[PDB]
Amino acid sequence: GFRKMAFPSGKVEGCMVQVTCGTTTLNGLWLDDVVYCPRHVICTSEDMLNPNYEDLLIRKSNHNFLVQAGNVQLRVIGHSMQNCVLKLKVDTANPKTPKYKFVRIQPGQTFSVLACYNGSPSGVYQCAMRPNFTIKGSFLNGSCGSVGFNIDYDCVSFCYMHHMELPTGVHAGTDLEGNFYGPFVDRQTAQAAGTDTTITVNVLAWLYAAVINGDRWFLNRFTTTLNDFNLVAMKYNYEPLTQDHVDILGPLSAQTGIAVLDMCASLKELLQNGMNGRTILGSALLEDEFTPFDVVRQCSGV
Amino acid sequence: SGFRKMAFPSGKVEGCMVQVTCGTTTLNGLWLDDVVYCPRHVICTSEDMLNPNYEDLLIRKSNHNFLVQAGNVQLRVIGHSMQNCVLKLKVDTANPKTPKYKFVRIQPGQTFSVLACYNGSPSGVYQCAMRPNFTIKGSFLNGSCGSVGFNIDYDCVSFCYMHHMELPTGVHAGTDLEGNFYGPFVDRQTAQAAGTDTTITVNVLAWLYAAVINGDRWFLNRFTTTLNDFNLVAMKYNYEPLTQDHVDILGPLSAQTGIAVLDMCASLKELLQNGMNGRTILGSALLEDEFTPFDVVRQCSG
């Protein structure tokens, strides 16, 4: 079976805390003796319309921040702002800190989101960073500071911290250095994303997955150049491939014996001729939120 | 806003998973207090699995034939019994990470989270529903037996599923934590078919309400139906009947959207006898039936 699968969330659950300033409360990430959270925690609701964060933060001291792990307060002993993230040094090193790294992901890459409220994990689900740098998440009031992550061996790579829901109902946030993905700002104002596109490298990974499972009617006898493929794909609102995309498809190419550019020629035929009422892996829709790594991970184990 | 298939955070269950080996057979166990629960076919050789007499095989085993590993630590087995299709190994150490828990038997159409594990190590988490034919559509590979399904309510884990088998059709079968299979299956290495599956109608209606809450409305109509006339059409299409209890449980979603349950039933009836005409609902080309009304209310409250 093929399912959207999240990483086991326990290593991240052990890092979630609550951060409050005044009556504004959201989630933070407690790693070693530092808590990371969205800087708009320092705003009242009226502040968020047009905030001057530097001005607002110079008014705050360590003793204005309430950090709680459950009902246990963690005393704040220093604070600083890095882009759109606040870092609060606390006096206790988190004994559940996993091995971790901060990463900035590419569009197309997937990650698990641990949706949290008041520092308490509520649910986990899988997301892809869209080409327009939004994610199609599920978030309610109080969810900011929830994080997205991948887990490789035993190391947690944090890649996303949640800040905002756009008018269209999709979501926007930052990496853990506080830099937004996309052309968004943490202000209570209506912001639009670019028109989205289909994640071509993931569609190719899905076609490879179909082949591995014996579903291969769409393989044609042609090949293409990468440049010709990119120029055609863009007319169908598909993303162009990069050299890194070609490389990450390498393992599936080797597993199936189907050259990357041959699969591109097959996809191109699918694009210009349609599916003709046929299905691939049970579906009439091409799936674009499974990466090549997701295909390998779900068809091969951990 | 937003709507996503979401699992419970898995940390509380991750702290309970161990590896269980007997001879050349290895799978996963669930370690609660001083007892480890795992599928009994771990006592089988590849020859025994074809037609096993489990009581015979078990009486010929001693405690030392069982190797239980929690991470890098071997747990000493000091007792063993069998409860239906589940083996219970008594160990000399209590699991410090045992959560508050209970064993429950889930009803068809209810959902739960699965923590897929290999060699005692958590690999991924996803949401499943118990199908009306008592299969589940999971994602499981070799080495995954003993993985468990669960729900979390406040701080209590309700374990409802332990994994044993993949049917020839690719769906999955297992037991509750008393070792009783869901459905007419047996833990023998033979090809087994399920009863004809039906669609979980109350869940489809819940998901249609979710679609309206998120702005997807093209499928609505001004028609209404009686409950009985709806059920005549549902049964014609191999949908489960909708009961008055189901109507009542959908009440909160009906109030939140202003759409009477029987008006949504008229919409569903039109979809069943007309199709979607290549359109999508919440990004799906098929009618989704693995969200309960509770799943939708929890995710879409407000």
From Swiss-Prot, chain A:
Active-site annotation: 40, 144
Reactions it catalyzes: TSAVLQ-|-SGFRK-NH2 and SGVTFQ-|-GKFKK the two peptides corresponding to the two self-cleavage sites of the SARS 3C-like proteinase are the two most reactive peptide substrates. The enzyme exhibits a strong preference for substrates containing Gln at P1 position and Leu at P2 position
Cross-link (Glycyl lysine isopeptide (Lys-Gly) (interchain with G-Cter in ubiquitin)): 4, 89
UniProt subcellular location: Host cytoplasm; Host Golgi apparatus; Host nucleus
Outcome of swapping residue 188 to A: Does not affect ability to cleave and inactivate human TRMT1
Result of changing residue 144 to A: Complete loss of 3C-like proteinase nsp5 cleavage
Topology feature Cytoplasmic, residues: 1-302
Outcome of substituting residue 48 to A: Does not affect ability to cleave and inactivate human TRMT1
Residue stretches making up the Peptidase C30 domain: 1-302
Mechanisms controlling activity: Inhibited by pyridone-containing alpha-ketoamides compounds 13a and 13b. In turn, alpha-ketoamide 13b (tert-butyl (1-((S)-1-(((S)-4-(benzylamino)-3,4-dioxo-1-((S)-2-oxopyrrolidin-3-yl)butan-2-yl)amino)-3-cyclopropyl-1-oxopropan-2-yl)-2-oxo-1,2-dihydropyridin-3-yl)carbamate) inhibits SARS-CoV-2 replication in human lung cells. Inhibited ex vivo by michael acceptor inhibitor N3. Inhibited ex vivo by compound 11a and 11b.
Role summary: Cleaves the C-terminus of replicase polyprotein at 11 sites. Recognizes substrates containing the core sequence [ILMVF]-Q-|-[SGACN]. Cleaves and inactivates human TRMT1, preventing tRNA guanine(26)-dimethylation of tRNAs. May cleave human NLRP1 in lung epithelial cells, thereby activating the NLRP1 inflammasome pathway. May cleave human GSDMD, triggering alternative GSDME-mediated epithelial cell death upon activation of the NLRP1 inflammasome, which may enhance the release interleukins 1B, 6, 16 and 18. Also able to bind an ADP-ribose-1''-phosphate (ADRP).
Subunit structure: 3CL-PRO exists as monomer and homodimer. Only the homodimer shows catalytic activity. Interacts with host FBXO22; this interaction promotes the proteasomal degradation of nsp5.
Name of the protein in its database record: 3C-like proteinase nsp5
Organism: Severe acute respiratory syndrome coronavirus 2
Whole sequence portion shown: 3265 to 3566 of 7096
